Amino acid sequence: QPMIARDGPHPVDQPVHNYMVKRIHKRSLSAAFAIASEALSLLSNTYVD
Amino acid sequence: QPMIARDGPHPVDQPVHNYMVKRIHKRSLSAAFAIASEALSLLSNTYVD
Secondary structure (H helix, E strand, O other): OOOOOOOOOOOOOOOOOOOOOOOOOOOOOOOOOOOOHHHHHHHOOOOOO | OOOOOOOOOOOOOOOOOOOOOOOOOOOOOOOOOOOOHHHHHHHOOOOOO
8 A cells, every 4th residue: 555754743654565365165056957767768778679 | 948057955957848739720701692593594595695
């Protein structure tokens, strides 16, 4: 931060430095996907049908 | 229909498919047309007049 030079019945000011630390926040996403029993019976054949 | 993926205390979602069936409806159009008897006698002389 900057600083102003003044006079009179005021204390002399000094330059000030600030330090900040922020942290991450974790979230997620989810989506389902279904398949039926007839489709599973039709898909698992392995070169027979 | 589309899907939105979300988190938190929400159950996970799966997309939907909709099947609809419509059937036809039968209408008509009718218009009348009259011919006088003397006109029918004139048009059907059969090679006399």
